[PDB]
Amino acid sequence: TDFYTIKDAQADLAIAPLNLTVLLAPYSTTPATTLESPTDGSLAIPPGYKSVGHFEKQAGLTLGNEFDSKDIEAYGEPEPIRTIINKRTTTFDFAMYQNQRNVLELIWTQDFSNIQPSEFGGIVLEAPKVPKNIYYRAILVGMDDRNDRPIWLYWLMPKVKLDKLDNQTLNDDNVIEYKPTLKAFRDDVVGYSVAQGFAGPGWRDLVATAGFGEALTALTITPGSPTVTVATGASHTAQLLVEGDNGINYTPDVVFTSSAPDKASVSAAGLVTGVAAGSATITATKGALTATATVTVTA
Amino acid sequence: TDFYTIKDAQADLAIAPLNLTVLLAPYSTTPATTLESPTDGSLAIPPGYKSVGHFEKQAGLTLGNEFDSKDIEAYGEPEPIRTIINKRTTTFDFAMYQNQRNVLELIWTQDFSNIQPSEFGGIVLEAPKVPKNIYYRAILVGMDDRNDRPIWLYWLMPKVKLDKLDNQTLNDDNVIEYKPTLKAFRDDVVGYSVAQGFAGPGWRDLVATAGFGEALTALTITPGSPTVTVATGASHTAQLLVEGDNGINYTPDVVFTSSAPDKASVSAAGLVTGVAAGSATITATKGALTATATVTVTA
Amino acid sequence: TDFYTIKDAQADLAIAPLNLTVLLAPYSTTPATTLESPTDGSLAIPPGYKSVGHFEKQAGLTLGNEFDSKDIEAYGEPEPIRTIINKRTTTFDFAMYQNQRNVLELIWTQDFSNIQPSEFGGIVLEAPKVPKNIYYRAILVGMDDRNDRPIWLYWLMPKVKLDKLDNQTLNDDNVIEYKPTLKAFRDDVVGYSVAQGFAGPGWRDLVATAGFGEALTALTITPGSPTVTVATGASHTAQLLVEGDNGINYTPDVVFTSSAPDKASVSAAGLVTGVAAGSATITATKGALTATATVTVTA
Amino acid sequence: TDFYTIKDAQADLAIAPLNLTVLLAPYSTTPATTLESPTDGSLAIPPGYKSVGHFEKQAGLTLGNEFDSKDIEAYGEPEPIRTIINKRTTTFDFAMYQN
């Protein structure tokens, strides 16, 4: 065995967040559990999460993790017999550009929902008497677009608080930047402080390679031998679902073909409509893996 | 024999009270004899023991022990011929944060059960003209969570009394702390002043190593070969019970398998349900030890 | 039952005296029974109590409690058979900045009410040839401001006397501080030496959880179904009253709505004003609980 | 009213010390009160002040001001109730050439 086989390097698993956005929601909003829609796996932001818009490219977004642990030392032991990690402090910071309501609320620790614009649109936002402890739910979601198969990777922080505010420098040749450092706290209802997740059509290809689940070996068409009506109606169409050995829906990834197009009409998605009564064979093929089903059309 | 073998140090026997809570009950309550539930060994607190809530981390909780002894000295004997130890005084102190009824009753040596809030919820707690002699029942129970197998170690004090009250300091940036020093007395009906106890799955793992009882050398299935009915009914399900030689129930620790899943269905809890008639072998494996039972299912 | 449920820790019951003030009144003043105004529950200080002003933050205010007890010991009993607690001495000390009349009177144990300033406003305060035994009535009231719902917690001492005076240091970079230690005695008329009390909307929120009285389970509209006249007059307006099962007035906490605004107009205070004749339904909602009343307006 | 009228910027009021000199005098000399001659407003150095001559251009002449103050904090007040500024120390440094 040579060195390269042992190394087993997969350049595809390296994910570059080509686009990124941060969505903040008030603490009353139900925290998000996953960003994948149950319908078709598309990106689905839960209601109440509103983005903070553009932020500075050069600084980007910085995530920091810090451990605070106490080690128990016994006599004669060079290394501790037991170490106690109290917490894992997670923070993240960025540099927003936009002077919208939520950004100013975040930086001023105040609720400006009651602020009403004056007769000419002018507003005045007063800093509170003492800073308030306001908690938000944060979704940091980024898209890596490769071969038109995006990978959406996101950080879910169900409870964050404004921990630090950097210095604000005003220049005549630059826009105003707000640079807060937000600390993520533990949330009891969901049981985690920060969660990292992946989703998207691009990630579905790399699920097996990354080591989550089992490698795809066989393809199976879940609807077996369906009967479709020639006449128009609610039961005139039947939707096919293709699955794998590891339990992942591979329908968007497979290619649908019909042996007899007139008897049954199949699309790329997998819908089956029986134009003419008879027997047809619908085959879903992805790579070298093939699944076949038979459709009977009765008028 | 090298030095390490002689030392025979077990780093798993070091228990750190990662979480700690103090529960106080009125003297009329029946004192707790153990915090282990006889049903399944889980942490069960007798009714009437109400917790005091949060308390200061930095101060922590301090246990103190003192001995009062008199030495009988004889002529020509450099050391005493007999030592009469009159009493072992046990005390403990901590700094509570919460301003609830039991805490204020404890610090004020008064019963506030008759205090009713005013029309708008306000209350006034008048200190008694003379401090009262009030006794409580105390439980100091702490959880050490290691690899999701908690160890609950507790101190039971069937008769405690407020002995001292530290100076209280009001600061504009610090919460109000009540710091009582409670002295444990002897309770005649139960027979002790303080009792230290251990419980939990982690202690069940470490009970044999710690030197209490004998080590676990073999397993035994007490139900042996039971009978189970296919038809639904009260006797349709039979619960197994794995026991150790040292008399400790090791059912949660062992792993249950069934030779023929159709004949007899067994779960992690060990319950046998006869889906189909036939003879099956139930195997409970823990570590390198194995127990076997035969279950026959009759239709 | 897991450990957290047994602990049952309420972080909202921790009260931090964000602001604090000490009010001293001459012994002839009627002692304060409570700081809660019976009219609306707001903070109401009885007349004659004049505040001492600012005092040092770093030193803060220190409250100390001491017990004077004697133990009766019998033959063969390691612990005392009876403890006779003679008294509970309470003291409190702080460091005032302001050179008011009352502060200097307190530190000098003299009555300066007859001191008249000279032609240009100068005064001279001669210490008495022998210190006097002067008693005051003291209120130590602090406010914790959380989400604009203050909690006022106070200590009432109906009879205090200057017990100690710390060393006074003069520095060119420090104001002059008077640091007295006042001991609270027993007032025969009210029957106590120190009384701790709580009030405010925040306490009304937390009074049920703290264990005083019973919890709020249902609401009630005590006025029931009132009548209001369209014509202007004394009886034209009728004030509603929302009450809880535990006997606490929850009118500020509930939200008032009117089914038909024209028939009956109700504000946040709950006052029903009959603009137009007709039947309207007034709904008071608090959390998940709701109370309903019917108001009929006759022209 | 537009922004530039409100700003009211006067470029002439910006003074650049094109030439500089430092004159030291012994403590017995009567201190100067003003450098304007009463006769015609010309620059008039009082007697006893002798210049130190050339000094380094790149280093320039650095003036520094430092306040030392103590703030009195009361209970419940986030901001001090009184600030006692003890002193405003002034220093200046330069790199002389002449021996």
XYZ file of N, CA, C and O in Angstrom, chain C residues 2-98:
388
model
N -34.946 13.585 37.241
C -33.574 14.023 37.060
C -33.216 15.096 38.086
O -34.073 15.636 38.792
N -31.920 15.400 38.162
C -31.412 16.256 39.229
C -31.958 17.676 39.128
O -32.257 18.305 40.149
N -32.083 18.201 37.908
C -32.512 19.586 37.735
C -33.932 19.805 38.243
O -34.225 20.842 38.848
N -34.830 18.850 37.994
C -36.194 18.976 38.497
C -36.220 18.982 40.020
O -36.960 19.759 40.635
N -35.412 18.125 40.647
C -35.342 18.093 42.105
C -34.808 19.414 42.642
O -35.319 19.949 43.634
N -33.776 19.962 41.996
C -33.202 21.222 42.457
C -34.226 22.349 42.403
O -34.346 23.131 43.352
N -34.980 22.435 41.307
C -36.053 23.415 41.134
C -35.571 24.828 41.467
O -36.056 25.486 42.390
N -34.598 25.288 40.688
C -33.966 26.578 40.926
C -34.631 27.654 40.079
O -34.753 27.509 38.859
N -35.056 28.733 40.732
C -35.674 29.876 40.069
C -34.676 31.027 40.085
O -34.430 31.629 41.137
N -34.102 31.335 38.921
C -33.125 32.413 38.839
C -33.765 33.788 38.979
O -33.051 34.766 39.222
N -35.087 33.886 38.833
C -35.763 35.171 38.951
C -35.936 35.616 40.395
O -36.204 36.797 40.635
N -35.791 34.706 41.357
C -35.949 35.055 42.762
C -34.711 35.713 43.353
O -34.768 36.191 44.490
N -33.602 35.749 42.619
C -32.407 36.440 43.082
C -32.591 37.938 42.882
O -32.686 38.411 41.745
N -32.632 38.684 43.983
C -32.888 40.118 43.957
C -31.596 40.842 44.296
O -31.008 40.611 45.358
N -31.155 41.714 43.391
C -29.950 42.502 43.585
C -30.334 43.945 43.854
O -30.998 44.565 43.011
N -29.950 44.524 44.987
C -30.341 45.916 45.280
C -29.572 46.910 44.415
O -28.576 47.512 44.811
N -30.054 47.073 43.179
C -29.383 47.955 42.229
C -29.311 49.379 42.758
O -28.290 50.057 42.599
N -30.382 49.852 43.385
C -30.364 51.127 44.085
C -30.749 50.892 45.536
O -31.515 49.976 45.836
N -30.212 51.709 46.436
C -30.477 51.558 47.859
C -30.466 52.923 48.524
O -29.664 53.787 48.161
N -31.356 53.117 49.494
C -31.342 54.338 50.284
C -31.788 54.055 51.710
O -32.603 53.157 51.962
N -31.244 54.840 52.636
C -31.535 54.733 54.058
C -32.237 56.008 54.494
O -31.713 57.112 54.303
N -33.419 55.856 55.080
C -34.232 56.972 55.538
C -34.323 56.918 57.054
O -34.667 55.877 57.622
N -34.014 58.036 57.702
C -34.029 58.141 59.152
C -35.081 59.151 59.581
O -35.186 60.236 59.002
N -35.853 58.792 60.599
C -36.872 59.673 61.138
C -36.706 59.795 62.644
O -36.255 58.850 63.300
N -37.064 60.943 63.216
C -36.965 61.104 64.669
C -37.911 60.159 65.394
O -38.918 59.702 64.850
N -37.563 59.866 66.649
C -38.290 58.858 67.413
C -39.753 59.221 67.623
O -40.567 58.329 67.883
N -40.110 60.502 67.517
C -41.500 60.900 67.690
C -42.372 60.487 66.512
O -43.601 60.470 66.643
N -41.772 60.160 65.372
C -42.542 59.783 64.195
C -43.209 58.427 64.398
O -42.661 57.538 65.054
N -44.401 58.278 63.835
C -45.089 56.995 63.869
C -44.325 55.987 63.018
O -44.036 56.267 61.848
N -43.973 54.822 63.558
C -43.179 53.864 62.783
C -43.938 53.350 61.573
O -45.162 53.206 61.589
N -43.187 53.076 60.510
C -43.784 52.580 59.279
C -44.108 51.098 59.405
O -43.258 50.298 59.809
N -45.340 50.733 59.057
C -45.736 49.331 59.034
C -45.387 48.665 57.711
O -44.995 47.494 57.692
N -45.524 49.392 56.606
C -45.151 48.883 55.295
C -44.879 50.064 54.377
O -45.361 51.175 54.613
N -44.099 49.810 53.330
C -43.779 50.818 52.332
C -44.679 50.736 51.110
O -44.441 51.446 50.128
N -45.700 49.889 51.149
C -46.582 49.664 50.015
C -47.849 50.486 50.210
O -48.547 50.327 51.216
N -48.136 51.361 49.258
C -49.317 52.207 49.363
C -50.573 51.366 49.163
O -50.694 50.676 48.145
N -51.520 51.389 50.102
C -52.759 50.615 49.912
C -53.579 51.068 48.718
O -54.408 50.291 48.227
N -53.386 52.299 48.240
C -54.176 52.789 47.116
C -53.860 52.025 45.835
O -54.768 51.524 45.162
N -52.576 51.919 45.481
C -52.206 51.281 44.223
C -50.964 50.404 44.324
O -50.493 49.908 43.292
N -50.415 50.193 45.518
C -49.244 49.358 45.672
C -47.922 50.027 45.371
O -46.883 49.357 45.426
N -47.919 51.319 45.057
C -46.681 52.023 44.773
C -45.909 52.289 46.063
O -46.438 52.181 47.172
N -44.636 52.640 45.906
C -43.782 52.924 47.052
C -44.220 54.224 47.717
O -44.149 55.295 47.108
N -44.669 54.129 48.967
C -45.120 55.286 49.729
C -44.383 55.317 51.057
O -44.553 54.418 51.885
N -43.568 56.348 51.256
C -42.818 56.524 52.497
C -43.630 57.399 53.443
O -44.094 58.477 53.041
N -43.839 56.979 54.689
C -44.585 57.817 55.621
C -43.859 59.123 55.865
O -42.616 59.183 55.816
N -44.595 60.203 56.124
C -43.947 61.501 56.340
C -43.066 61.488 57.579
O -43.329 60.781 58.554
N -42.004 62.290 57.530
C -41.036 62.376 58.597
C -39.760 61.597 58.355
O -38.753 61.868 59.019
N -39.773 60.646 57.426
C -38.588 59.866 57.090
C -37.788 60.632 56.044
O -38.203 60.733 54.886
N -36.641 61.169 56.449
C -35.775 61.935 55.565
C -34.553 61.099 55.209
O -33.871 60.580 56.098
N -34.284 60.973 53.913
C -33.170 60.164 53.449
C -31.836 60.813 53.806
O -31.723 62.033 53.951
N -30.810 59.969 53.944
C -29.467 60.450 54.256
C -28.673 60.828 53.015
O -27.622 61.474 53.139
N -29.134 60.447 51.826
C -28.461 60.820 50.596
C -27.528 59.758 50.055
O -27.719 58.565 50.308
N -26.515 60.182 49.304
C -25.545 59.254 48.746
C -24.709 58.608 49.844
O -24.529 59.164 50.931
N -24.200 57.416 49.548
C -23.228 56.764 50.411
C -22.312 55.902 49.554
O -22.630 55.570 48.410
N -21.160 55.557 50.127
C -20.066 54.977 49.357
C -20.467 53.658 48.710
O -21.055 52.786 49.354
N -20.140 53.520 47.422
C -20.471 52.303 46.689
C -19.601 51.131 47.126
O -20.108 50.034 47.385
N -18.284 51.342 47.207
C -17.370 50.231 47.452
C -17.599 49.611 48.824
O -17.647 48.383 48.958
N -17.738 50.444 49.857
C -18.077 49.921 51.175
C -19.476 49.323 51.182
O -19.710 48.278 51.800
N -20.417 49.967 50.495
C -21.778 49.477 50.466
C -22.449 49.609 51.820
O -22.103 50.462 52.643
N -23.430 48.744 52.054
C -24.134 48.677 53.325
C -24.021 47.259 53.856
O -24.295 46.300 53.128
N -23.621 47.124 55.116
C -23.396 45.817 55.719
C -24.398 45.600 56.843
O -24.515 46.437 57.747
N -25.123 44.485 56.774
C -26.050 44.057 57.812
C -25.467 42.850 58.534
O -25.048 41.881 57.893
N -25.440 42.908 59.855
C -24.896 41.832 60.670
C -25.897 41.372 61.709
O -26.601 42.190 62.308
N -25.952 40.060 61.922
C -26.852 39.447 62.889
C -26.045 38.566 63.829
O -25.214 37.772 63.377
N -26.291 38.703 65.129
C -25.620 37.904 66.143
C -26.652 37.340 67.107
O -27.656 37.992 67.399
N -26.407 36.131 67.598
C -27.296 35.472 68.544
C -26.590 35.325 69.883
O -25.429 34.909 69.933
N -27.289 35.662 70.965
C -26.782 35.467 72.317
C -27.580 34.348 72.970
O -28.749 34.540 73.323
N -26.949 33.187 73.132
C -27.637 32.006 73.627
C -26.793 31.316 74.687
O -25.564 31.409 74.687
N -27.475 30.619 75.591
C -26.844 29.812 76.624
C -27.383 28.392 76.541
O -28.586 28.187 76.352
N -26.493 27.415 76.680
C -26.842 26.010 76.523
C -26.934 25.338 77.886
O -26.027 25.473 78.713
N -28.027 24.616 78.110
C -28.238 23.858 79.338
C -27.814 22.421 79.077
O -28.400 21.737 78.229
N -26.801 21.961 79.802
C -26.210 20.648 79.589
C -26.529 19.741 80.767
O -26.378 20.142 81.925
N -26.971 18.525 80.467
C -27.305 17.533 81.475
C -26.255 16.432 81.496
O -25.489 16.252 80.545
N -26.228 15.695 82.602
C -25.271 14.609 82.761
C -25.587 13.490 81.779
O -26.726 13.020 81.701
N -24.575 13.060 81.031
C -24.732 11.997 80.064
C -25.250 12.426 78.711
O -25.387 11.574 77.822
N -25.542 13.711 78.521
C -26.031 14.202 77.243
C -24.908 14.930 76.524
O -24.479 15.998 76.990
N -24.393 14.404 75.411
C -23.341 15.131 74.682
C -23.799 16.473 74.147
O -22.992 17.408 74.071
N -25.069 16.599 73.776
C -25.622 17.841 73.269
C -26.525 18.485 74.317
O -27.077 17.792 75.177
N -26.677 19.810 74.290
C -27.511 20.472 75.300
C -28.959 20.017 75.221
O -29.495 19.752 74.144
N -29.593 19.929 76.392
C -30.995 19.534 76.448
C -31.930 20.701 76.169
O -33.106 20.482 75.855
N -31.442 21.934 76.275
C -32.247 23.109 75.982
C -31.317 24.289 75.753
O -30.363 24.490 76.508
N -31.599 25.059 74.708
C -30.832 26.251 74.374
C -31.716 27.470 74.588
O -32.815 27.550 74.028
N -31.239 28.410 75.395
C -31.973 29.628 75.714
C -31.303 30.771 74.966
O -30.227 31.236 75.360
N -31.937 31.228 73.890
C -31.407 32.318 73.081
C -31.953 33.622 73.649
O -33.147 33.909 73.536
N -31.075 34.413 74.270
C -31.517 35.635 74.933
C -31.982 36.679 73.927
O -33.066 37.257 74.075
N -31.185 36.933 72.891
C -31.516 38.002 71.959
C -30.814 37.776 70.630
O -29.864 36.995 70.525
N -31.313 38.476 69.612
C -30.717 38.513 68.282
C -30.388 39.965 67.963
O -31.270 40.735 67.566
N -29.124 40.334 68.135
C -28.669 41.695 67.888
C -28.489 41.900 66.390
O -27.797 41.118 65.729
N -29.109 42.950 65.861
C -28.991 43.315 64.458
C -28.310 44.671 64.357
O -28.681 45.610 65.069
N -27.305 44.764 63.491
C -26.593 46.008 63.254
C -26.482 46.241 61.757
O -26.567 45.308 60.957
N -26.296 47.501 61.380
C -26.040 47.826 59.985
C -25.185 49.080 59.912
O -25.335 49.993 60.726
N -24.277 49.106 58.943
C -23.360 50.228 58.803
C -23.150 50.569 57.336
O -23.297 49.722 56.448
N -22.786 51.829 57.109
C -22.640 52.414 55.784
C -21.813 53.684 55.934
O -21.516 54.120 57.047
N -21.442 54.275 54.800
C -20.558 55.442 54.784
C -21.198 56.561 53.968
O -21.057 56.598 52.742
N -21.872 57.484 54.648
C -22.514 58.600 53.970
C -21.495 59.657 53.556
O -20.447 59.840 54.183
N -21.836 60.369 52.481
C -21.049 61.481 51.969
C -21.602 62.841 52.364
O -20.824 63.754 52.656
N -22.924 62.992 52.380
C -23.565 64.296 52.462
C -23.525 64.847 53.880
O -23.733 64.116 54.852
